[PDB]
Amino acid sequence: LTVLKKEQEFLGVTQILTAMICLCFGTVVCSVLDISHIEGDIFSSFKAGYPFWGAIFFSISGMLSIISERRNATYLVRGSLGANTASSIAGGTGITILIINLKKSLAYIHIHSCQKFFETKCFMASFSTEIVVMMLFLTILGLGSAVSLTICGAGEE
């Protein structure tokens, strides 16, 4: 009951941090190098910058609940419920995306033998793939945490 919302402002802050991390895990890559040029099939979302929505969704998921921390309005409650549902869906979406990215990275490393064959392009691909995978994982986790936090608002009214 009241415990789930124990944190509404804390949940809002944590969701903001998670969304920011999810975006930044690949924003630097998108602002650094042409991810589309990333070879090895680990560029599933690096060039596309799909988290452009994912992390945002997580933030959005938290945002609708954040208003309930201080305003304490039923309309904010409904917004938080919708945001939490969207975050629940986005959690699975981001988890699947990150699993696909991890599988692609493993396949690329095995094909190119990145354990010992660490070429310049190989290093660039490794850094970009790490950035994309971290972004996707953070976006999925942000969706999950936003849904969990907004469960309190969903139960509020």
């Binding site: 944190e7 804390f10 941090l17 490794s126 971290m134």
Partner: protein, 32 residues
Amino acid sequence: PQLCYILDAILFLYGIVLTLLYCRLKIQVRKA
């Protein structure tokens, strides 16, 4: 490298966990 990258991801997870743990203290300082 790849092991180093996975360690970096685990470090990010641990940092996120620490931030979540400190979230309660931050809210109590600011909100409570």
